[PDB]
Amino acid sequence: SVLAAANPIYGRYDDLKSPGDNIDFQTTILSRFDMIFIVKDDHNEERDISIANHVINIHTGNANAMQNQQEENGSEISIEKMKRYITYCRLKCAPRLSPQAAEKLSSNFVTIRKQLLINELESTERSSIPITIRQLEAIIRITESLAKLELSPIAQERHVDEAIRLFQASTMDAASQDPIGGTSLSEIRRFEQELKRRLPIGWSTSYQTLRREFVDTHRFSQLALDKALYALEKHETIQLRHQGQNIYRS
């Protein structure tokens, strides 16, 4: 099994730049990998305070005590015991699937494949991170490993849900991470003009009414939904409450 560490071009990911020209790996090499995680840096000063606290604690003056309690309270096991347990589990158990899990995996794969096609037809370029039958085999292997952890001779929905969750995380973090890469913008400014004009601060309107109005006009549904959720992404005058019905203007 291969565990690889890499850095993107231009150091930081530079999300303003397109995903296509941020990764220099071809499609062939990426397909063999099946768990790719993008570790982006962030700044909110709270995670930063927590990390600073953790490092100042993890200096040798303090951790040498605290970590010891982890073997005294039963929270963590030593490395050698973990090695023995993992080799024992590797030798002994080898789980198997069940038809309900197979149906769930099939439906999930169809869903993600259709979502990839949906992104591709809009972006009008090939995806930099592909989704293939290799990925279905990958989810199957993840489920089998999850069942293998507890020595279960059969794999069930409990492990399948966790495997699907991990795959969805590793998919939405890298592949479906802003697929647009940033009618053109002419309708965007036109659409920004009307909502400022027709909807003042403090009042609200139903989503159905606006969708009907701007499908009756030239904007159509494809342009409106993206514009609506990006005006939300701007997050300085548009707020959603009460499910997807109440379009509140903050």
Binding site: W203, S204, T205
Partner: protein, 472 residues
Amino acid sequence: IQNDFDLNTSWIMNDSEFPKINNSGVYDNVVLDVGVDNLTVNTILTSEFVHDAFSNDALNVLRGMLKEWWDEALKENSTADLLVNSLASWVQNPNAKLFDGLLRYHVHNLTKKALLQLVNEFSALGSTIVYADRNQILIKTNKYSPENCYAYSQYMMKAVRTNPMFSYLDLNIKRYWDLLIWMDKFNFSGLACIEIEEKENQDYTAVSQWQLKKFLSPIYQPEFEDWMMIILDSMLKTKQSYLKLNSVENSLNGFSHLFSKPLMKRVKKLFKNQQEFILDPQYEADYVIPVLPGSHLNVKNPLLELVKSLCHVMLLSKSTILEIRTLRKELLKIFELREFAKVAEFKDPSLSLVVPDFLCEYCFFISDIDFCKAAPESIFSCVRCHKAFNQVLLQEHLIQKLRSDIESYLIQDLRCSRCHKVKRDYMSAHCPCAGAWEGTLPRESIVQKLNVFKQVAKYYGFDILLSCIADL
């Protein structure tokens, strides 16, 4: 249809909070205290797709009705005057017929927009807004001497009045501030003159309103009230000296040098005496920490909070930060503490519990009321008139606030962890991406609110509220 419960109507029913602007700091320039009147009527007279809209035809009809009311009231009609005065209370009170919550929300939003427009107009000229409210506005004046703001303040008054948006507003000046130390509505101290006079030096009187002093030890409050007056005198002296000479301002730079050594010696003596007399049984009366409603901090050494408050008052200078920090470190060196310790950080010793828009029938006067921070003998009486308020009404309003809070918590929405998108399904394990749902209203907030409600109901005698609590 009105019998059925609806989310939008419930949200527009309980959203009666009126925001305010407060820019704390230390000011050496002159500040004008003004009051605004007849705001609601001016807002009403002045200014299909939107489902939350109130019927515009009715709005125009009532605008014309109020216009003819004003016209008839101008020509010596007492009845029209009283009717105009009672129009606002008619708008607020649901007991009156032909009442619609949409109309009240419309008027409230329009009033907020008008207030922000007025703030924009005021800031257009040379000004700095310190405090904003439905009833009081504090404006910082660029000039230095109160005697030189007569025609200037009159000019802003006239210019504001001539604006068509503000034709029906009534504006009045109450006080002139020579030197102000402002951090909160209930926490300020400074030198003020009532009205500027001609050819004669104005009368200057010092005021001090500080609920913070109420949380100190009974034996150190005299020290607080002495040292605060001393530092205010030093600040006035240094500003006068600078004005005599002619983000930094030299009016105040160099004021802590006057009292540093006596303060150091006094703090040493106080620490020694507290060390010697803290464990004595008969001296334990004066070291008892008082308890007040809204208090949440548990702490041990009183002198530490005394010096923390004394330093936090000075820290509001915003222009002599380094000097104050040096003095704070020097003071903390008497204790065996360090500069950036968590124990040496000042916090708010009291919480807040505000009831929006309490109505005095004797004045048609509308104002908020804070049950925790405000001083006594003002919760039970109106601000303008000295008429006692009904008590069971206060308890009923408090219980309405509590029940509205509980309902709002119950009907809240859910938000994902990683992304902040809202839940759009009636039953789903988690977000399509990573993360799990969390409530928009945290549980600890409402728990703390119920705790402070319990404290309030325990401090005063409110048996209806206690019965309401006990039924949960």
